[PDB]
Design a protein around this ligand. Structure first.
Ligand SMILES: [Mg+2]
Lengths: 50, 153, 203, 119, 121, 149
RNA sequence: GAUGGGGAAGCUCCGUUUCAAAGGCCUGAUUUUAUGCAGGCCACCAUCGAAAGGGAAUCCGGUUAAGAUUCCGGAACCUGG
RNA sequence: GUUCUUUGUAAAGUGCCUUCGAAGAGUCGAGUUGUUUGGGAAUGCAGCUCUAAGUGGGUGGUAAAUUCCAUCUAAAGCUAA
RNA sequence: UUGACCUCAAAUCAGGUAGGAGUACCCGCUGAACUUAAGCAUAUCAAUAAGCGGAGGAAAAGAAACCAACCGGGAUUGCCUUAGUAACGGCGAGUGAAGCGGCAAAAGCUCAAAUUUGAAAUCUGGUACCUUCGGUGCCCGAGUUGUAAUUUGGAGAGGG
C-alpha cells in the first residue's frame, strides 16, 4: 500500500538490496562451489509474504 | 481501611462471644494505684544495661589481673527476672517471690496456664496492664512477664 | 519451659478454651487475604519444633485453601472413553492441601525457601496453614552452619518437588514392606523393574 | 599501518580526544573521495585507528573508576566479576567452611588418623 | 482524649516523605560518549546528477544522514561541520533504507562554493 | 495362537519394552574405570588399607545360619571389651555398628579376638611429626580372613 | 485488556470500578533553598481499539526522464512560547 | 618437607556411686469414598467425619475378642560413592 | 500534651533475590485411547504417550516407628539371583514384587522438648581502618512470645 509502516518499508529495503545477481569475482576464488544466486526472488514469480 | 476494621471487630467479637473462664480470668487487671507502686518497687531492681555491663567486665578483668579473684570482685546482683521459660522454671522450682503477667499477650495461650501454675505452686501472681510496661521495665520492647525472685533487705 | 505446656494444651482442641480461641481466629483469618504475611507464629512451639528460629531471615506466611475433592475439569462431564474413566465428582487429589498451600506460598515468595508448614485452623470451606520460610540470601543464614544447607541450589522449590515433610508423606517415602511400590521413587522403581537387562555374554 | 596502542597509552585524555577528532575528520575526507575513486582501501586503517583510540580512552576511564572504587564493598556491577550467575549466587569459601563449634570440638578431639597395617 | 474531626467519609492514604536515591555505587560507572554526534549524523553527500543539479539551482546541499537523526540534529551538525547558516531541512527515507537530507542554505552562502570546498563537484 | 504340544510360555513383552533396553556394552570399560577409581583412592589414602575392618557374624535365616560371614560393624560392647572408644575406633579404621546386639558369647569372643589382632597388627602414626612410611596393603579383609568355626 | 482481589495442581481463568489506605492541581510561600514546610481544590479511577467516525491550520502559478497541496516564486493560516 | 605463631589458666575423652532421664497432635489410629498396588475382610495415597495415649505407640501379609512374645521409636532435619 | 508497644502501610529509600532458555537422564502432578481379550463393558495397553510444575552434574533415597522368627541380621543405592515365583486376575487374556545369599561402593549424623539467670554470653546492617571469599573498633537495630554454650536415645544430664 502507499500508506505503509516503517517495518514493512525496512523489509522491502532489505529485499531490494538482496535482489542482485552474483558478483562475478566470486567464481574466481579457489575451491569455489557457488555458481549463481540460488536465493534470487522476483515479484512476478514468488511473493514475500510479509 | 480493612486493618482498622479487623482490629476493631476482633475486640467486638471477643466480648460478643461467651468467653470460657480461663480467659476473663484476665481483664480483672491490677488497679492503677497499686500498679504504680509495684512498678515503683520493681524499678529499683532493673537489669544492667550494655554500657554498665561493659564497664563491669572491664573492672572484673582488671580485678582478676591484679588480685585473681574468681570473678567475685563484683557483688551479688539483685535484678528482676524476665523471659517466659525462665520464669516458668522459677515458678516450678518455687524460687519466685512475686510474678507479674501481662494482660495482652497476643497468643493468649502463652500465658493462660500461668495463674493456675502460680496458684498450684503457691507463688503470688498479678495480672497487670502492659507488656510494653514490662518491656520498658526490663529494657526491652515487650516482656510479657516479670518476676521478683530475691529482694534486698 | 512453657513450650510443653503449649503442646499439651494444643492437644485439647475440643476443650472450651481452644474452641473459643479457634472460633475467634478463624473469623480473623477469613477477614484477611488468602495469602498474607504473619508477623509472628501463632504456635511458636510448633514452629520451633518444625525448625523455626526467632532470628532475622525466618518468615511466616498464613494461607487458606479450599477443602473437598478435585472435580475433573472436563466440559459438561464428558470424558470420551471407557466407563471406568467416566468418574467426575468423587475423584481425589493425590497431594495434600498442606502441600498445595505451601506451593502457592512458594510461588508468592520465590526468593525464599519453604521449610515446613503446620495446621492452625479450619472450617467447612477452608483449611488454614502457616508456612515457615527461610531467606537463603540473608547473611544470618549464609553463615550459621546449622542452616546454610538451604542455600545449596539443589533445594530450590522443595515443596514443588515434594521434598518437604508432607511431600515425602504424599510420595510414600518410608522404610518397610508396606512401601514396596514407593520407596526410592515410584517411577524409578517402575523403570528399574521394567528394564530389560542384556549382558555381553548372555545369561 | 595506523596507530599503535602502546604509544597511544602514554598520552593524556585531551590529546586522545583531539587525535580522535582529527581521525574522524580524516575519515569524512576519505569517505567523500570513495565516491569518486573506484577503490579506496585506506579507509580501513583509519577505521581501525578510531577503534584503537576509543579502546584506549575507555580503558583509561575504566581503570580510573576501578582505582576510585578500590578497597571497598559495593563496586559497580560491570566492574565486579562476571563469571556465571550460579557461581555468583553460590556460597563463598568462608560461608561454606563455616562449621558449628560442636563439630569443631569433635573434629579436634577425633580427627581421621593416618595409619598403616603390617606390624 | 478527643478525636480528630473528619469532614469526609472517605479515608485516603496519608502523604509520606519520599526520599531520593543515594546509591552506594554507580549504575554503569563510565558515562557513555555521544552516541549521535556531528560526524555520525552526516555520513556522505549524494553526488548523482539529480543531486548535483540542486547545488547551484536551488542552493541546496544533499547529504546522506544516519537513520537516528532528526532535522534539529542535521541542522546543528551542518552548522558545526561547515560553519554555514541553513534555511531549512527536508528529509526522506530512500527505498534502500538510508536517509537523505536536502539542506537548503541561507542566501548569504553559496552551495556551489561549499561543495567543492568539501571536495565533490 | 495355541498350537502343537509345547509348554505354556509367559513372555512379558506387551508394553513398549524396546524403550527400556539396557545392553551392558560398557562392562569392560566400566571395570577399567572401576580399577582406576580404586587406584586413585588408594593413592589418596596412601598409607591406609582402602577398607574398614568388619566383624564376623552369623547369617540370619535357617537356610543360612550354618554359615558365618562379615557384618557391617562392631558392637559398642565389643569395642568396649576390646578397650577403645567407638569414636577412636572409627578414626583408626574399625567399622562400628551401634544397632546390633550381642546375644552369642562365641560371636562376641571372636569379634573381641579379631579386634585384638587388628590392634596388634596396625601402626598408628603420630598426628604431627615424622610419618614413618610403611608400605600399605590394600585389603584388611584379606589380611584378616573370615574363618568358619 | 493489566492492577486490587477471587478461582485453578497448573499452563492460566474471572472481572474493569470491583469487599483497595488506588492520586495530581494550581496559587504560592521561602528567597541557608531546595522545593519541603503555609495553605486550599478535586475524586475520574490503567491502557489498547477507526489511514471511511470525531479532529487546530495552505492556496495559486511554475518545475522533473521519473516527485509534489511536500520542491521553487508569491500570498496566507494555526498552535506553542 | 621447611618456617612463624602457642593456641590454652581453654576444650575433649575415659572409671565408680547416686538422683534423674524432658523424645515432635486435627497427628497416629478408625469409618467411609475414590484411585492405585502382586497386597488378597482392604498395599500406598488423597477427600470428608470421628479423633488418642504414655510400662505408650507402630509393625509382625486372614477379619474379631482374650493372654503373651519379638522387633523398632513415627507425626522435625542434613549427608559423598 | 508527650513518649512507648502492637498491627498495618508508603517511598525511583540501602542492599539483594525470582521469572526465561535447555530438558537425554531426575523429582512430582495430571492423564488417555488405538491395541489384546479372536466380539465387549472389569481388565490390558499403562500407574504409559500428550499436558503442567521444579532441579543438578547427577538427581532422588539414606542412617530403621526396618527385615525377620534364626545360633538372628543392621543406612541408602546398583548388579547377579530370588522369579516369571508368593500373589492379583470376566481366576480369562494377562499381570506380578519382597526377605535371605554373592558382589560393587561404603560414612556418618543434628534440631525441638532443660534456668546462663552471678549477669543475651548470640546475630544482620551502617561507619572508620586493615593484610578484603574476610578481620577489628564504634554505633543503631534484631532478639527474652528466646538468639548463643550444653544433649539427640547408640544416649545423655545434675551432683560426689
Ligand atoms: Mg477442589
Amino acid at each position: 500500500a502507499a500508506q505503509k509502516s516503517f517495518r514493512i518499508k525496512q523489509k522491502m529495503a532489505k529485499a531490494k538490496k538482496q535482489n542482485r545477481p552474483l558478483p562475478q569475482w566470486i567464481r574466481l576464488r579457489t575451491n569455489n562451489t557457488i555458481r549463481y544466486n540460488a536465493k534470487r526472488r522476483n515479484w512476478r514469480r514468488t511473493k514475500m509474504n510479509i | 481501611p480493612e486493618y482498622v476494621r479487623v482490629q476493631r471487630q476482633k475486640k467486638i467479637l471477643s466480648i460478643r462471644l461467651k468467653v470460657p473462664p480461663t480467659i476473663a480470668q484476665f481483664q480483672y487487671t491490677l488497679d492503677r494505684n497499686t500498679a504504680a507502686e509495684t512498678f515503683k518497687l520493681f524499678n529499683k531492681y532493673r537489669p544492667e544495661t550494655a554500657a554498665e555491663k561493659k564497664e563491669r567486665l572491664t573492672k572484673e578483668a582488671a580485678a582478676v589481673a591484679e588480685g585473681k579473684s574468681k570473678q567475685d570482685a563484683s557483688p551479688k546482683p539483685y535484678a528482676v527476672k524476665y523471659g517466659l521459660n525462665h520464669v516458668v522454671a522459677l515458678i516450678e522450682n518455687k524460687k519466685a517471690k512475686l510474678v507479674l503477667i501481662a494482660n495482652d499477650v497476643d497468643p493468649i495461650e502463652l500465658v493462660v496456664f500461668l495463674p493456675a501454675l502460680c496458684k498450684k505452686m503457691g507463688v503470688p501472681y498479678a495480672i497487670v496492664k502492659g507488656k510494653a510496661r514490662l518491656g520498658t521495665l526490663v529494657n526491652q520492647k515487650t516482656s510479657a512477664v516479670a518476676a521478683l525472685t530475691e529482694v534486698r533487705a | 519451659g512453657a513450650y510443653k505446656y503449649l503442646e499439651e494444651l494444643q492437644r485439647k482442641k475440643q476443650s472450651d478454651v481452644l474452641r473459643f480461641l479457634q472460633r475467634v481466629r478463624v473469623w480473623e483469618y477469613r477477614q484477611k487475604n488468602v495469602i498474607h504475611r504473619a508477623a509472628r507464629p501463632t504456635r511458636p512451639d510448633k514452629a520451633r519444633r518444625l525448625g523455626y528460629k526467632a532470628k532475622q531471615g525466618f518468615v511466616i506466611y498464613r494461607v487458606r485453601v479450599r477443602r473437598g475433592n478435585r472435580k475433573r475439569p472436563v466440559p459438561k462431564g464428558a470424558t470420551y472413553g471407557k466407563p471406568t474413566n467416566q468418574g467426575v465428582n468423587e475423584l481425589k487429589y493425590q497431594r495434600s492441601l498442606r502441600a498445595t498451600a505451601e506451593e502457592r506460598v512458594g510461588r508468592r515468595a520465590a526468593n525464599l525457601r519453604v521449610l515446613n508448614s503446620y495446621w492452625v485452623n479450619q472450617d467447612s470451606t477452608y483449611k488454614y496453614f502457616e508456612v515457615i520460610l527461610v531467606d537463603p540470601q540473608h547473611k544470618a543464614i549464609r553463615r550459621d552452619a546449622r542452616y546454610n544447607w538451604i542455600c545449596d541450589p539443589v533445594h530450590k522449590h522443595r515443596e514443588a518437588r515434594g521434598l518437604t515433610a508432607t511431600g515425602k508423606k504424599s510420595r510414600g517415602i518410608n522404610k518397610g514392606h508396606k512401601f514396596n511400590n514407593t520407596k526410592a521413587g515410584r517411577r524409578k522403581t517402575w523403570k528399574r523393574q521394567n528394564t530389560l537387562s542384556l549382558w555381553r555374554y548372555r545369561k | 599501518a595506523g596507530v599503535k596502542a602502546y604509544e597511544l597509552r602514554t598520552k593524556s585524555k585531551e590529546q586522545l580526544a583531539s587525535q580522535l577528532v582529527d581521525l574522524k575528520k580524516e575519515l569524512a575526507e576519505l569517505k567523500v573521495q570513495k565516491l569518486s575513486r573506484p577503490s579506496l582501501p585506506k579507509i580501513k586503517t583509519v577505521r581501525k585507528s578510531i577503534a584503537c583510540v576509543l579502546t584506549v580512552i575507555n580503558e583509561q576511564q575504566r581503570e580510573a573508576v576501578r582505582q576510585l572504587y578500590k578497597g571497598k564493598k559495593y563496586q559497580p556491577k560491570d566492574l565486579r566479576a562476571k563469571k556465571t550467575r550460579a557461581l555468583r549466587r553460590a556460597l563463598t569459601k568462608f560461608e561454606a567452611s563455616q562449621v558449628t563449634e560442636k563439630q569443631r570440638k569433635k573434629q579436634i578431639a577425633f580427627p581421621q588418623r593416618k595409619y598403616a597395617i603390617k606390624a | 482524649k478527643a478525636l480528630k474531626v473528619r469532614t469526609s467519609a472517605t479515608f485516603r492514604l496519608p502523604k509520606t516523605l519520599k526520599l531520593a536515591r543515594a546509591p552506594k555505587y554507580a549504575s554503569k560507572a563510565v558515562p557513555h560518549y555521544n552516541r549521535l554526534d556531528s560526524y555520525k549524523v552526516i555520513e556522505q553527500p549524494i553526488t548523482s546528477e539529480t543531486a548535483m543539479k540542486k547545488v547551484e539551482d536551488g542552493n541546496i546541499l544533499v547529504f546522506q544522514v544516519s537513520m537516528k537523526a532528526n532535522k534539529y540534529q542535521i541542522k546543528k551538525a551542518v552548522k558545526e561541520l561547515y560553519e554555514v547558516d541553513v534555511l531549512k531541512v527536508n528529509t526522506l527515507v530512500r527505498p534502500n533504507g538510508t536517509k537523505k537530507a536536502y539542506v537548503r542554505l541561507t542566501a548569504d552562502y553559496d552551495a556551489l562554493d561549499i561543495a567543492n570546498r568539501i571536495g565533490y563537484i | 495362537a495355541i498350537s502343537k504340544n509345547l509348554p505354556i510360555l509367559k513372555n512379558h513383552f506387551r508394553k513398549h519394552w524396546q524403550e527400556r533396553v539396557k545392553v551392558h556394552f560398557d562392562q569392560a570399560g566400566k571395570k577399567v574405570s572401576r580399577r582406576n577409581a580404586r587406584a586413585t583412592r588408594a593413592a589418596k589414602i596412601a598409607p591406609r588399607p582402602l577398607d574398614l575392618l568388619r566383624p564376623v557374624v552369623r547369617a540370619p535365616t535357617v537356610k543360612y545360619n550354618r554359615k558365618v560371614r562379615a557384618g557391617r560393624g562392631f558392637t559398642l560392647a565389643e569395642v568396649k571389651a576390646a578397650g577403645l572408644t567407638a569414636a577412636y575406633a572409627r578414626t583408626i579404621g574399625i567399622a562400628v555398628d551401634h544397632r546390633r546386639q550381642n546375644r552369642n558369647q562365641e560371636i562376641f569372643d571372636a569379634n573381641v579376638q579379631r579386634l585384638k589382632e587388628y590392634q596388634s597388627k596396625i601402626i598408628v602414626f603420630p598426628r604431627n611429626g615424622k610419618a614413618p612410611e610403611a608400605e600399605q596393603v590394600l585389603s584388611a579383609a584379606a589380611t584378616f580372613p573370615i574363618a568358619q568355626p
